[model samples]
Target chain A: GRRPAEEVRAEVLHAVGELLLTEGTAQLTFERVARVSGVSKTTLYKWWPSKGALALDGYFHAVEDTLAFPDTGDVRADLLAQLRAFTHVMTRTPGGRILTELIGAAQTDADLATAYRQLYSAQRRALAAERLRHARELGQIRPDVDVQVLVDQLWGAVYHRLLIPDEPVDDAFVTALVTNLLDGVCPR
Target chain B: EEVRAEVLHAVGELLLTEGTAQLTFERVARVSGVSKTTLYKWWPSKGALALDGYFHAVEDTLAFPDTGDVRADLLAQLRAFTHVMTRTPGGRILTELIGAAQTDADLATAYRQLYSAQRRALAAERLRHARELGQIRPDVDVQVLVDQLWGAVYHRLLIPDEPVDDAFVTALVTNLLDGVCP
Candidate 1:
């Protein structure tokens, strides 16, 4: 009686996520993941081409639900909710360090980099854009507003802090970010 | 002057052509005919030398505008920044330094001290002037503005899912200066 394929993959990714939080990406190896998940090394290798690929998948799995964009009709509220959720995840959880490590590794590992863009960054961008486009249609934001740049300014700034580690990514920062984006920085 | 310039030239060539991993005192000295000891004396580490060479390679190109209208200056500087990031080798050099800084502690320190911090300070100065002139909102945070503009560019450079083009620059500046809300 073998388990379903999705179940096994989920368990393996869950193990990888735990390992990422407890040990960090440096110690991540397919062998360890297989050992922890009771999945075969061959299966792990076949499923994920590289450590970064597996780690990124696991990272996404663990955080995808929390990072969802809200559609509360009020786009400002929606952006704030999403940004706060993103900021909290990046700041409070091991998710932040895991993300930065994956990004850093992606710089050199071409395969992992592709996985990141495909599996993570691109998907996240699309999620934000969906809500933004909805807002534009509803006349919540100006029709002329570029949702792509808006997404980058909000989340990219958070990523910038995570990667650069120069400034704090806290409640205040997220609040200011949403406000600035919604109500431009210039005086009324 | 010749020796220092030559060393920088070698560093720049290696950085642009070969990348950061290939940069070393031995290589610089070999290429430039400068001694490793002098290189050490002039700069504490290879990262320092790399920063020096990077700045020397692109001077005044990244400077913030200061003529008057904060919005105009902001747009001009953002456009100039995008040009450097896209139109020149400086962009690759910067991404290398930043990506390398993630793991290399020494490079990270040198990068902040020599590059990121200085860039922030420059923008902060300009924004402060604008705030005083009542061009920008009084309650707005300058540092966050820096992140919105420059940080957004770096994010695109590193993530690179989208283009860091002139269009993106104008949109970013426009959105920041004028509230997106109608």
Candidate 2:
């Protein structure tokens, strides 16, 4: 009945979020969401169309704060720090598993892929790229440097190590990658 | 029976158009027109079949070159790999396979065959030459270096937040060869 932003926030988003984190998507069901969140299934659907969409929304909301862009005037330093933080969140925390699940699910489900594109990829890139713009202004690295590629190299490398465990994403790995990325930032 | 070409072709096509959700033996059977008993006899799990499909679905090998300059040589490898596998059929195939490998162990092994064993062989050859030339660090693990070097391209291919074009490819090679902070 009550469909305000705040009510649905707790009723729908978090219900799926908790279920997703603790037991995983397998544990998520509309009935369980309603029972857990105390919001009816009809209203839950109103909040998020399906279990897959709700699960991603939940995961993103839970870890959005952890993804704050690190900007310390020194763009290279800031990026390196943020990348390290990202690897930590991605490889170590509950958010890590949730993210993996979301990306994996986005593959099979088209609607969820759209939701992922809308919610995570675009927004995350815009915010993260802003930090690069800051470093560009400060002149820590090449001003003309294409930040998108630089960002992809750093984050993509991290996400690759995260999903593909041929090699672990440890501190040494982080340092090495940051070292490599620094090459692009600094001009010869 | 079709020279391993037709089976992988169908696999790649189905994986791209249909994702891994409908990638059952029966479905693969109908599309590939192979008998289930034969399919099951050949590979014990879906992972094996999917991975075998991916191996043949694209260019699986390259001649790791040595052009005297390690940087130039490595850049060539990066671009060459990017050219074939960054977009269209190859990119999507690898990207989808990466996701599927997350859940399937047999598939994951085959994936490592390409991403890990094969790539490492190429990279190790390049890095050794680089190391002798004083380009790369002696202490750096060759496997780790390959991860940092190619992981970015693979990441963008899968996630696709931006273009995997000349700009990113150039920057990626630059990053791998030179330290980020000057």
Candidate 3:
């Protein structure tokens, strides 16, 4: 029986994910993945060509299951929901941990950096753009709001918490984030 | 638990009171009344022992008391977080770990597991709760938002030696929730 390409790809991805979690990208070798997945090294090479491609594919696949945009009609509400969900998934899952490592690793590896910016980060920005458009249409967000900067600010906070362990991430923080975004932080 | 915790606490004390370079295994064993063999048995490497001690100290310090309002509470939490990083044993451990982890792969993964992921999870949980309570705008990209807020704080903490005070947190939260460009 000819095994489905999707199943094999899934297994390869699972192997890559496990290696990334335990060993990180530095130790991610084709042979190691094959050993972990019970597939031959030749099979992995046949599927992915280069280690970067394999890493990128694995990274994308891990997030693809969770990555999404909220279009709940109320732009602010929808954007917040998406942001909340994004935090939940990134903070709680193995994917979030791997993503942080990948970002750090990207500082040195140009190929991984390019792939991340193109495949993962660009998609994220696109989603933010969509949300901003909706917010503008509803007259909730100001017309002059720089959508890219807005996206950067939000994501930057999460990155700070990830790298710095002293911060407290709690319900109060989230509410404050929402209120501040919608109503402004200063006294009105 | 007491013995293990004591050893870690002693390590933490050495790291903050002295310096990371001075935190030798001999000093840790001498302060905690544990044999070098016992310490080595528990943590096979110096980085392992240091990371464990660092994360334990951080975990002990985790707290976010609510004060009825999200904005005030967040401000308080951010300020408290920044203060801890600026003026605590945990702060020094974090900086040392980040630098060390740059060269050590195993230690880096351990650091990510013990510290980075947990922080993100905690932040995400906060956002989720707020959404359920109808406080945060439902459409905001929670992951991106969390990363950016914390990332800016981290940039300040690691890159510059200055304190990340209440003013920084205020500006960060204000700009994040609203916008910086006028």
Candidate 4:
């Protein structure tokens, strides 16, 4: 019996993600992934534009749940929960270290930067934007709020600290970011 | 202070127009009209003068404002920040410094200690005064506010795809203080 295409994709992504996170991108190759994943070369070619893209997609798959946005009715609570998880992964985990390495490498590697933005940052931004849109519709946040700017303010701060390392991007930082933005900094 | 300003300005002019190869205390003194003794008194060597001149150029552009209204001050500071970032050689120079710092530990420590720390402190000081005057809530985290306001700019700058123009800065300041919630 032939395996489902989705099943094959899952297997290929899993193999690639494992290879990337464990040994870095140096050893990753289509031949190796196809061989280990038991997926055909033709299918991999059809799915991924490039090996870098495949790698980013695979990396996103591996850490998707950890960085997922939540919808707990209250935008404030949801943002707090999501940002804390993001900070943990970015600040404390090997997965996060790999991500930082990719970003650092992306500074010089044009292909990797394109792959990262297209496969990773764009996907993450869309997911977060969808959640914020839902919050806006539910009246959890002001309807006029610019979702893009709001996204930048909340998540961009974490990324800033990650790159700049001027301060800790801890639980307290996440809470304050969510609280200050949601509650407004001006006195009530 | 006036003499210091003229000499540093001359240092920058020479460095930018003629390159570092052409920068000498003799030339700088002639161009700036400041005594070589005064220049040497202020700085230990040509290398020191060059470094100080570089930072002075940046600080001259990146200066913060305190207009008594936190909102206005934030707007002014962020506007200046983005301008220096997008419109000046300072932006590209800082980018090169940041990129090089990845492998250069000495540059990394000096950048953080001398430049990044001082920039954040300037913003933090302004925020602290704002908090004292009740412009911002007591519970607000001044450091986090600094991150959200300025870090957002740095993020866009590093990422390069997004627009970090005046409109973005205006929106950033507004969205931050107004709160997204009802």
Candidate 5:
């Protein structure tokens, strides 16, 4: 009777993701998603209030599957792994291109901001803060290391580099980034 | 600068004033007073030409200020950086580059090269010089510092609601330095 509700949900999400990837959020519509996925518009709206809501869910799931957060007891190692995974996925995967377009779309649409945070920034930030707390507890980082600033510096630089795409996000670059941000420069 | 500096300034003026769609070899040659033969002789394509033009404007506009104070120099740099980013056509050019990038590899390559990396590299150079002068804090990766500095600015620009206002810029530099500047 249910006919695999999860399957329909998956298909609709997949359809929406494709729309976002190719045409951006502007061309995204219930009609298009239904046509592409063979899912009903009523079913789509029943689960999410708007296209923005649906898109955010699909975006996060795709990224999570790709970047699936690692959990080593060593927070520094774990955080470093996350950064490495993030840069790799963003640079190499179609997921990266999808992110780039969504970000560009988020810039102009006020409604998208809510989805952006609910699905992306807030979750990533919480993970960052939690890792910092663990690192601090282990004396890997200073007890005083500001989690918010750390999160911003780490993630902000990645996104900046992604958009500007000035330098390659390789192991050497992240090592320098983490080292400098943590150890800091000596004042003359 | 003057029209005679390079075809780049002309290209920038076109992209900023008109649009990226206006960035053609023929159009550039006409406005720059350079010849089509010369333009093709140099780049061979509109994408290459526009890419170079974007690169030229970036290099020309961003300057390294040596105030002898790391924080002050950075602030001044940010001020100058922000000036070009928001005021000049640099910002719009970025949008167009990213916009066109959806289809064109050449534009994407140009944008990825000049858009933020060029700025990051130039800004990093200033920080490295300052660190050598004994102005930076201990162990601060002038590399990540460069990211934190410019990344915040780019973030604000890309995130419309973030508001790349004077107060925010000042606060960002302040927060960055306050964390490590000894």
Candidate 6:
């Protein structure tokens, strides 16, 4: 007779993602999400105790759904694919813009920043680690590579482009990067 | 050309040598022998003047020579660019500009547009040449690729005071261009 917990969770996530993508995090409120999703505020709070918890859940959910890395057998191909997908998301999506704004806002909000560092950043790093692990298994990458540093380099580039408004991330630049990254400078 | 170059050079020297707080119009005028009124006429505000001077200085200084090998050439260019950004006076101004622009909407827009166009132009030329020479993969997305490469360096430079030395550049270039695995 009652809606399943999975159903309730799905409804909440859907409402949160829609609101976050369209109205931004500033507009995310208990009453608003309930009103938008046709669910009651009591139901929303029953699942997520606090706004930070709700936000973190919504953020991670979206990433899980949209930002999952590809599993192509070729390590070079997979890394490039992952970077390419990330570049598109970071540059093009409304959700991406929201993430950028939230990151900037977190700088001023200590609690929010800590939540992001502990919850959001960790999740992202985990996803990155999984991809790096795949690359290692494929013999496509050197065993000595530091997975953390590699993720930092790749993500750092996207972060830099986001913060600095003018840099263009065109097709050719992406190709050269893949080539140079797969094969070293020395003629091989 | 000479006068504009000289003015930008003077500004760059002032920025690197004296820092932003001391970079007054009167001082720039005194050092360059260009009257404050003339400088103001050309650049209506201090931010504008400083940005223009900064842009010209970067334009004149940041040039990448092609060495037939795209990978080597790219590594050299990126390293050199990071070196100039960190070691030169322009680096300080750029840092100050980023901080100032964060609070000033108009300045932020101008800085973003100018910086974006400058980077796009350079990347366009370099990538086009590399494509023609068959150095890069045909399927690669040039804009996204360059963004990741330079974006990482810019991010580090903007957020921290750490020197953009050879080691940093090496890691960035090698990781982004080639796989980071040992």
| Predicted structure with the largest TM-score when compared to the true one | 1
Q: Give model 4's DockQ, 2 decimals.
A: 0.53
Tens-digit per-residue lDDT, B12-102, candidate 6: 6766565566767787888887764777766566776677766666664566667886677777788778777777666656656665564
Distance from true location, Cα of B94 in model 2, Å:
2.2
Best by DockQ: 1
Clashing pairs in 4: none
DockQ of all models, two decimals each: 0.74, 0.42, 0.12, 0.53, 0.22, 0.22
- Superior by DockQ: candidate 4 or candidate 6: 4
Using lDDT as the yardstick, the better of models 3 and 5 is 5
lDDT for position B159 in model 4: 63
Give per-residue CA lDDT, model 3, range B120-166, as digits (tens): 67766776666566666675545545555666666544434224666
Which portions of model 1 show Cα errors greater than 4 Å?
A1-3, B1-22, B30-33
Candidate 3 on A1-188: residue-level lDDT in tens? 34687787788898786677567677889988888888898878887777777876777766554557666667656656766776776677656666666666554556766776665666666777777767776776777565554554555455555544445555445554555555653333
Write model 4 residue lDDT over A1-188, tens digit each, in one string: 35787877888999998898787776778888989988888889889978778888999998898888887787777888888888887777766666765676666678878888888987888888899999999998788877777777888888877766778778888888888888789888
User: Compared with the true structure, what per-residue lDDT tens digits does model 2 show for residues B79-157?
Assistant: 7778767444556656666677777767777777644566567677777777776666665666666766677777676
Interface RMSD of 5: 4.3
lDDT of 1 by residue, A81-158 (tens): 888888888878878867876777677767877999987899889988899999999998899888999888999998
TM-score of candidate 2's A chain against the true A chain: 0.82
lDDT of 4 by residue, B1-182 (tens): 66788888877766544445556888787877867488878876554566567666667666777778888878987888787677755555555455555555656566676568878888899899999999888878899988899988877766664678888898888877788878
Better of 2 and 6 by lDDT: 2
Off by over 4 Å in 4: A1-6, A26-35, A39-51, B1-54
Structural similarity to truth (TM-score) of each candidate: 0.91, 0.79, 0.50, 0.82, 0.69, 0.64
Q: Write the per-residue lDDT of candidate 5 for residues A54-162, one digit (tens) a residue.
A: 7777777656665655667665567677888888877766667766766765654667766777777677677777777777777766665555556656777777766
Docking class of 2: acceptable
* lDDT, residue A138, candidate 6: 73
* lDDT for model 4: 0.78
CA shift at A112, candidate 4, in angstroms? Answer: 2.5
